[PDB]
Enzyme design. Structure first.
Site, PDB file in Angstrom:
ATOM      1  N   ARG A  46       0.852  -1.220   0.000  1.00  8.29           N
ATOM      2  CA  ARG A  46       0.000   0.000   0.000  1.00  8.29           C
ATOM      3  C   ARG A  46       0.877   1.256   0.000  1.00  8.29           C
ATOM      4  NH1 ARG A  46       0.431   1.743   5.325  1.00  8.29           N
ATOM      5  NH2 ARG A  46       0.788   0.007   6.780  1.00  8.29           N
TER       6      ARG A  46
ATOM      7  N   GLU B  85       4.882  -3.088  25.984  1.00  7.50           N
ATOM      8  CA  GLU B  85       3.730  -2.961  25.047  1.00  7.50           C
ATOM      9  C   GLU B  85       2.567  -3.787  25.601  1.00  7.50           C
ATOM     10  OE1 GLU B  85       3.205  -5.071  21.380  1.00  7.50           O
ATOM     11  OE2 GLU B  85       2.801  -3.210  20.282  1.00  7.50           O
TER      12      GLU B  85
ATOM     13  N   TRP C  75       5.593   2.916  18.922  1.00 11.00           N
ATOM     14  CA  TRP C  75       4.320   3.516  18.428  1.00 11.00           C
ATOM     15  C   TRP C  75       4.381   5.045  18.455  1.00 11.00           C
ATOM     16  CZ3 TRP C  75       1.928   0.573  15.436  1.00 11.00           C
ATOM     17  CH2 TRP C  75       1.789  -0.792  15.687  1.00 11.00           C
TER      18      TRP C  75
ATOM     19  N   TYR D 280      -5.535  -1.759  20.072  1.00 12.79           N
ATOM     20  CA  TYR D 280      -5.591  -3.071  20.761  1.00 12.79           C
ATOM     21  C   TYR D 280      -6.111  -2.943  22.191  1.00 12.79           C
ATOM     22  CZ  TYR D 280      -2.471  -4.661  16.986  1.00 12.79           C
ATOM     23  OH  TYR D 280      -1.891  -4.927  15.776  1.00 12.79           O
TER      24      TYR D 280
ATOM     25  N   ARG E  79     -15.598 -20.765  22.348  1.00 19.16           N
ATOM     26  CA  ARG E  79     -15.944 -19.336  22.134  1.00 19.16           C
ATOM     27  C   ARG E  79     -14.949 -18.423  22.861  1.00 19.16           C
ATOM     28  NH1 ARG E  79     -22.606 -19.807  23.065  1.00 19.16           N
ATOM     29  NH2 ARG E  79     -22.940 -21.118  21.216  1.00 19.16           N
TER      30      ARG E  79
ATOM     31  N   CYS F  57      -2.868  -5.791  13.095  1.00 17.03           N
ATOM     32  CA  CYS F  57      -2.209  -6.859  12.286  1.00 17.03           C
ATOM     33  C   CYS F  57      -2.391  -8.204  12.999  1.00 17.03           C
ATOM     34  CB  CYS F  57      -0.717  -6.608  12.095  1.00 17.03           C
ATOM     35  SG  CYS F  57      -0.283  -4.897  11.686  1.00 17.03           S
TER      36      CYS F  57
ATOM     37  N   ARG G 136      -3.282 -11.333  10.308  1.00 19.69           N
ATOM     38  CA  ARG G 136      -3.660 -11.064   8.897  1.00 19.69           C
ATOM     39  C   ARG G 136      -2.429 -10.628   8.095  1.00 19.69           C
ATOM     40  NH1 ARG G 136      -3.273  -5.948   7.638  1.00 19.69           N
ATOM     41  NH2 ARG G 136      -3.280  -4.492   9.413  1.00 19.69           N
ATOM     42  N   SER G 137      -1.422 -10.092   8.774  1.00 15.56           N
ATOM     43  CA  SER G 137      -0.254  -9.444   8.130  1.00 15.56           C
ATOM     44  C   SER G 137       0.951  -9.585   9.052  1.00 15.56           C
ATOM     45  CB  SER G 137      -0.569  -8.000   7.877  1.00 15.56           C
ATOM     46  OG  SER G 137       0.521  -7.337   7.261  1.00 15.56           O
ATOM     47  N   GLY G 138       2.004 -10.244   8.587  1.00 14.70           N
ATOM     48  CA  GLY G 138       3.197 -10.468   9.425  1.00 14.70           C
ATOM     49  C   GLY G 138       4.460 -10.123   8.667  1.00 14.70           C
ATOM     50  N   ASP G 139       5.149  -9.060   9.100  1.00 13.07           N
ATOM     51  CA  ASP G 139       6.531  -8.750   8.661  1.00 13.07           C
ATOM     52  C   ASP G 139       7.464  -9.759   9.325  1.00 13.07           C
ATOM     53  OD1 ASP G 139       9.062  -7.794   8.188  1.00 13.07           O
ATOM     54  OD2 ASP G 139       8.871  -6.174   9.638  1.00 13.07           O
TER      55      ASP G 139
ATOM     56  N   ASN H  41       5.790 -10.258  17.781  1.00 13.87           N
ATOM     57  CA  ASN H  41       4.391 -10.690  18.016  1.00 13.87           C
ATOM     58  C   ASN H  41       4.360 -12.104  18.614  1.00 13.87           C
ATOM     59  OD1 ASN H  41       3.585  -9.119  14.890  1.00 13.87           O
ATOM     60  ND2 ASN H  41       3.350  -8.209  16.928  1.00 13.87           N
TER      61      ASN H  41
ATOM     62  N   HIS I 222       5.171 -11.860   4.930  1.00 14.99           N
ATOM     63  CA  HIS I 222       5.999 -11.105   3.952  1.00 14.99           C
ATOM     64  C   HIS I 222       7.340 -10.681   4.545  1.00 14.99           C
ATOM     65  CE1 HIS I 222       3.358  -8.189   5.941  1.00 14.99           C
ATOM     66  NE2 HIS I 222       4.381  -7.324   5.841  1.00 14.99           N
ATOM     67  N   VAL I 223       8.294 -10.502   3.645  1.00 16.08           N
ATOM     68  CA  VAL I 223       9.631  -9.908   3.904  1.00 16.08           C
ATOM     69  C   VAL I 223       9.709  -8.637   3.061  1.00 16.08           C
ATOM     70  CG1 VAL I 223      12.118 -10.250   3.631  1.00 16.08           C
ATOM     71  CG2 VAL I 223      10.682 -12.145   4.418  1.00 16.08           C
TER      72      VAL I 223
HETATM   73  C1  LIG Z   1       5.346  -4.080  16.689  1.00 16.97           C
HETATM   74  N1  LIG Z   1       6.118  -2.885  16.349  1.00 16.97           N
HETATM   75  C2  LIG Z   1       5.379  -1.705  15.906  1.00 16.97           C
HETATM   76  C3  LIG Z   1       5.367  -1.542  14.401  1.00 16.97           C
HETATM   77  C4  LIG Z   1       4.734  -0.413  13.869  1.00 16.97           C
HETATM   78  N2  LIG Z   1       4.671  -0.178  12.545  1.00 16.97           N
HETATM   79  C5  LIG Z   1       5.236  -1.059  11.706  1.00 16.97           C
HETATM   80  N3  LIG Z   1       5.202  -0.881  10.366  1.00 16.97           N
HETATM   81  C6  LIG Z   1       5.782  -1.785   9.546  1.00 16.97           C
HETATM   82  N4  LIG Z   1       5.731  -1.563   8.212  1.00 16.97           N
HETATM   83  N5  LIG Z   1       6.421  -2.897   9.992  1.00 16.97           N
HETATM   84  C7  LIG Z   1       6.504  -3.196  11.310  1.00 16.97           C
HETATM   85  N6  LIG Z   1       7.127  -4.315  11.737  1.00 16.97           N
HETATM   86  C8  LIG Z   1       5.899  -2.257  12.266  1.00 16.97           C
HETATM   87  N7  LIG Z   1       5.944  -2.463  13.608  1.00 16.97           N
HETATM   88  C9  LIG Z   1       7.508  -2.861  16.544  1.00 16.97           C
HETATM   89  C10 LIG Z   1       8.140  -3.904  17.228  1.00 16.97           C
HETATM   90  C11 LIG Z   1       9.506  -3.879  17.460  1.00 16.97           C
HETATM   91  C12 LIG Z   1      10.264  -2.812  17.021  1.00 16.97           C
HETATM   92  C13 LIG Z   1      11.737  -2.752  17.286  1.00 16.97           C
HETATM   93  O1  LIG Z   1      12.426  -3.755  17.195  1.00 16.97           O
HETATM   94  N8  LIG Z   1      12.171  -1.533  17.623  1.00 16.97           N
HETATM   95  C14 LIG Z   1      13.532  -1.066  17.714  1.00 16.97           C
HETATM   96  C15 LIG Z   1      13.728  -0.226  16.449  1.00 16.97           C
HETATM   97  C16 LIG Z   1      15.130  -0.310  15.847  1.00 16.97           C
HETATM   98  C17 LIG Z   1      15.083  -0.450  14.337  1.00 16.97           C
HETATM   99  O2  LIG Z   1      14.181   0.121  13.676  1.00 16.97           O
HETATM  100  O3  LIG Z   1      15.972  -1.143  13.795  1.00 16.97           O
HETATM  101  C18 LIG Z   1      13.705  -0.200  18.936  1.00 16.97           C
HETATM  102  O4  LIG Z   1      14.787  -0.243  19.562  1.00 16.97           O
HETATM  103  O5  LIG Z   1      12.753   0.548  19.284  1.00 16.97           O
HETATM  104  C19 LIG Z   1       9.646  -1.759  16.346  1.00 16.97           C
HETATM  105  C20 LIG Z   1       8.284  -1.785  16.108  1.00 16.97           C
HETATM  106  O1  LIG Z   2       2.940  -5.780  15.525  1.00 12.80           O
HETATM  107  C1  LIG Z   2       3.115  -5.545  14.328  1.00 12.80           C
HETATM  108  C2  LIG Z   2       2.888  -4.284  13.683  1.00 12.80           C
HETATM  109  C3  LIG Z   2       3.098  -4.178  12.360  1.00 12.80           C
HETATM  110  N1  LIG Z   2       3.493  -5.241  11.576  1.00 12.80           N
HETATM  111  C4  LIG Z   2       3.756  -5.056  10.133  1.00 12.80           C
HETATM  112  C5  LIG Z   2       2.964  -5.939   9.178  1.00 12.80           C
HETATM  113  C6  LIG Z   2       2.990  -5.077   7.924  1.00 12.80           C
HETATM  114  O2  LIG Z   2       4.267  -5.122   7.295  1.00 12.80           O
HETATM  115  C7  LIG Z   2       2.730  -3.697   8.518  1.00 12.80           C
HETATM  116  C8  LIG Z   2       1.277  -3.333   8.688  1.00 12.80           C
HETATM  117  O3  LIG Z   2       0.747  -2.935   7.399  1.00 12.80           O
HETATM  118  P1  LIG Z   2      -0.707  -3.471   6.914  1.00 12.80           P
HETATM  119  O4  LIG Z   2      -0.685  -4.985   6.986  1.00 12.80           O
HETATM  120  O5  LIG Z   2      -1.742  -2.841   7.772  1.00 12.80           O
HETATM  121  O6  LIG Z   2      -0.747  -2.959   5.485  1.00 12.80           O
HETATM  122  O7  LIG Z   2       3.377  -3.723   9.815  1.00 12.80           O
HETATM  123  C9  LIG Z   2       3.754  -6.480  12.130  1.00 12.80           C
HETATM  124  O8  LIG Z   2       4.135  -7.438  11.475  1.00 12.80           O
HETATM  125  N2  LIG Z   2       3.530  -6.557  13.482  1.00 12.80           N
END
Ligand SMILES: CN(Cc1cnc2nc(N)nc(N)c2n1)c1ccc(C(=O)N[C@@H](CCC(=O)O)C(=O)O)cc1
Ligand SMILES: O=c1ccn([C@H]2C[C@H](O)[C@@H](COP(=O)(O)O)O2)c(=O)[nH]1
Length: 287
Positions: A25, A63, A85, A111, A152, A171, A191-194, A202, A232-233
């Site tokens: 997106r 968190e 956040w 959440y 349930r 997500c 639904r969506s996992g980086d 997570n 996804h990666v």
């Molecule tokens: C769950 N979450 C929030 C969050 C918000 N928007 C996102 N958006 C995308 N596209 N992808 C994500 N994984 C994502 N994650 C996280 C979880 C861990 C870290 C993390 O490892 N943070 C390091 C950041 C260091 C870095 O960016 O390398 C820190 O020290 O705060 C960041 C965000």
């Molecule tokens: O706890 C979190 C927060 C974010 N994301 C990643 C998934 C996607 O790469 C992105 C969210 O984008 P949408 O799936 O909403 O497009 O952040 C995670 O994997 N875990």
């Protein structure tokens, strides 16, 4: 011996080899597999915190405690050193999302608000929502204690009416719990996992939550099933993940709880002890 972390590494290997290249997106390249399933043992204190690359455990715990408080103020999490956040609560990000009337840090009804105040009218982060809406987390604990065989036992953040008010749509979308032989298990629908940054965080989060609920309910733990929609990666994490895939996993750490913790609201950062988590060096994956 840590076969479960090897499953996560095999998922990453499978996505890099077989995944579809799709621009998301935001217009950035991803490699995607739709529909993946993996199971992690939670038995005997085990939390699936990846050993092949340091997970931000301080962030995971803070968190999760912030979710449990029903808190939607990014500033409260930032004050504990956890900035994950902060971008989504910024004056700029709020204005660009058409939330010009919101105060900085207000992530909307995300959440924590859905877990503790499901269906309550959101009126900003500074409002006291005590005993407003449906307390899903308390309700799930009541089901586990009184009706452990229930089909349930669902914790959901997917409030369609509130999605337009949220900084981000959830997500980690819903979690189902089940009790067998006095063991609490969890199936997480994501639904969506980086796979780079998000999914390891997570998995640690829902593993810890399952242990915390089991503790409150006087139960043992079973397994965490992880269900992915878009697994996804990001194209800019591929080299970092290829470095990680060369590493052999160590035994996952265990968690233990300190003190008299009677309810899900009685956990503190100090009450949660992570045992034998000595991960391999962190691998930088930006965004
Ligand atoms: C769950 N979450 C929030 C969050 C918000 N928007 C996102 N958006 C995308 N596209 N992808 C994500 N994984 C994502 N994650 C996280 C979880 C861990 C870290 C993390 O490892 N943070 C390091 C950041 C260091 C870095 O960016 O390398 C820190 O020290 O705060 C960041 C965000
Ligand atoms: O706890 C979190 C927060 C974010 N994301 C990643 C998934 C996607 O790469 C992105 C969210 O984008 P949408 O799936 O909403 O497009 O952040 C995670 O994997 N875990």
């Amino acid at each position: 011996k840590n076969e479960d972390e090897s499953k996560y590494l095999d998922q990453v290997r499978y996505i890099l080899k077989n995944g579809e290249r799709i621009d998301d997106r935001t217009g950035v390249g991803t490699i995607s597999v739709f529909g993946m399933h993996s199971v992690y043992s939670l038995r005997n204190g085990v939390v699936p915190v990846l050993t092949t690359k340091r997970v931000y455990w301080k962030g995971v715990v803070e968190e999760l405690l912030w979710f449990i408080r029903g808190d939607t103020n990014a500033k409260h999490l930032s004050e504990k050193g956890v900035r994950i956040w902060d971008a989504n609560g910024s004056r700029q990000f709020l204005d660009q999302c058409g939330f010009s009337d919101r105060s900085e840090g207000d992530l909307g009804p995300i959440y924590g608000f859905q877990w503790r105040h499901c269906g309550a009218e959101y009126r900003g982060m500074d409002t006291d929502y005590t005993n407003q809406g449906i307390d899903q987390l308390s309700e799930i604990i009541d089901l586990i204690k009184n009706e452990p065989h229930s089909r349930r036992i669902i914790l959901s953040a997917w409030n369609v009416k509130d999605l337009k008010l949220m900084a981000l749509p959830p997500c980690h979308t819903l979690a189902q719990f089940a009790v067998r032989n006095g063991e609490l298990s969890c199936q997480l629908y994501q639904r969506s996992g980086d796979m780079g940054l998000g999914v390891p965080f997570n998995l640690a989060s829902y593993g810890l939550l399952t242990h915390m609920i089991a503790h409150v309910c006087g139960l043992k733990t079973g397994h965490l099933c992880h269900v992915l929609g878009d697994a996804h990666v990001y194209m800019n994490h591929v080299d970092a993940l290829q470095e990680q895939l060369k590493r052999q996993p160590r035994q996952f750490p265990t968690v233990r709880f300190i003190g008299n913790i009677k309810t899900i609201d009685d956990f503190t950062y100090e009450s949660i002890v992570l045992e034998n988590y000595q991960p391999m060096p962190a691998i930088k994956m930006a965004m």
